[PDB]
Amino acid sequence: DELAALKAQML
Amino acid sequence: AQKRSEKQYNDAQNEINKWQRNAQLALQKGDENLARQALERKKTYTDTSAAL
Numbered sequence: 642d643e644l645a646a647l648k649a650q651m652l
Numbered sequence: 653a654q655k656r657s658e659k660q661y662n663d664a665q666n667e668i669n670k671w672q673r674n675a676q677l678a679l680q681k682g683d684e685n686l687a688r689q690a691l692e693r694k695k696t697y698t699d700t701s702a703a704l
Contacts, residue, residue, distance in 0.1 A: 646688060646691075
């Protein structure tokens with residue numbers, strides 16, 4: 642989930 | 653009972669939609685915690701929906 646969040650974080 | 657069950661299922665779907673909007677807001681606000689909470693909420697709700 643954290644890894645997914647990192648991708649989301651760029652946006 | 654079926655109608656009541658459907659209503660509960662419908663409510664869960666509505667909650668998920670609200671959570672999705674919150675997740676988008678978190679990305680804009682750059683808050684890790686808000687985004688994480690929404691994802692967790694979506695998963696339990698999905699499991700609950702499947703059970704329903």
